[PDB]
Amino acid sequence: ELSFGARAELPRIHPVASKLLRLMQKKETNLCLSADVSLARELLQLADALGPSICMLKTHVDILNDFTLDVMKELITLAKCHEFLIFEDRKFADIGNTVKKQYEGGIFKIASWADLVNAHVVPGSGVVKGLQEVGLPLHRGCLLIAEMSSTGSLATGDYTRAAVRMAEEHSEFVVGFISGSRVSMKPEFLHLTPGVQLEAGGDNLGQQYNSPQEVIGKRGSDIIIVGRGIISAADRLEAAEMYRKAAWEAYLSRLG
Numbered sequence: 001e002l003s004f005g006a007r008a009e010l011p012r013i014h015p016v017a018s019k020l021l022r023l024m025q026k027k028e029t030n031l032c033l034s035a036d037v038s039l040a041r042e043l044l045q046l047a048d049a050l051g052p053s054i055c056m057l058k059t060h061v062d063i064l065n066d067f068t069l070d071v072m073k074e075l076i077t078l079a080k081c082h083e084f085l086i087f088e089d090r091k092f093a094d095i096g097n098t099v100k101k102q103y104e105g106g107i108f109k110i111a112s113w114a115d116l117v118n119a120h121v122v123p124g125s126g127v128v129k130g131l132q133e134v135g136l137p138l139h140r141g142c143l144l145i146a147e148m149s150s151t152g153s154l155a156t157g158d159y160t161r162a163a164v165r166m167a168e169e170h171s172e173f174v175v176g177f178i179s180g181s182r183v184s185m186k187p188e189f190l191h192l193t194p195g196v197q198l199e200a201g202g203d204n205l206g207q208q209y210n211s212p213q214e215v216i217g218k219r220g221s222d223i224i225i226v227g228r229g230i231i232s233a234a235d236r237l238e239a240a241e242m243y244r245k246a247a248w249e250a251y252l253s254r255l256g
């Protein structure tokens, strides 16, 4: 079991994964902020204040009421300044020919600003092939959704195994997983886990929470993704620091 810094140097590492792992090690953070807000100003103020505490900022561009490409330029300035990646949680899930256009084009031009995107595996490997046609030339990476945090998830058993095989067969572009646990035994792949809070509970629409210690320490994931546990708190900086310290110590204690 290797440190993030050592995993950044693995022979088969993807450049996006390497950049991420190096800044995780440098900044002692394995926290991804889920910036689930509707105002550009709030997104940018969170990115600036929490930038030092996070390895990654996850977006849902399609809920920003005042999206423009200039907002994403300003977010990139902050990502470069504070050293974090931008992950658009778009969950591409269509045929290859369609997702290529949804990734490159339209109003959002996701591929122009997102270091990482993700995809569901249910359509078969054409979803990855279509994305990679845009993402490989743009030096991007992708995460496959192997497990989900929500009640009634069908991403279990053979489905999870299919996601791992699809990732391991598209390693030029796929850099890891959305999962609740370590699902790949190959250390070149990242594991990012949403459904994380310090306290037990859930929401009223099927979200289920587990703690950083559970998902990083016991379940062997790499990165926690935290939305409301930070966003709904009064002091979002202190909340981010609490989640960062929790995830980082769970990782260290796992390492030995």
Ligand SMILES: O=c1ccn([C@@H]2O[C@H](COP(=O)(O)O)[C@@H](O)[C@H]2O)c(=O)[nH]1
Pocket: 034, 036, 060, 089, 147, 148, 149, 150, 178, 194, 195, 196, 207, 225, 226, 227, 228, 229
């Ligand atoms: O299995 C998954 C994959 C993605 N997300 C996303 O991660 C965030 C979780 O936010 P919260 O429940 O921490 O507020 C949301 O943006 C949600 O869309 C999940 O919650 N579960």
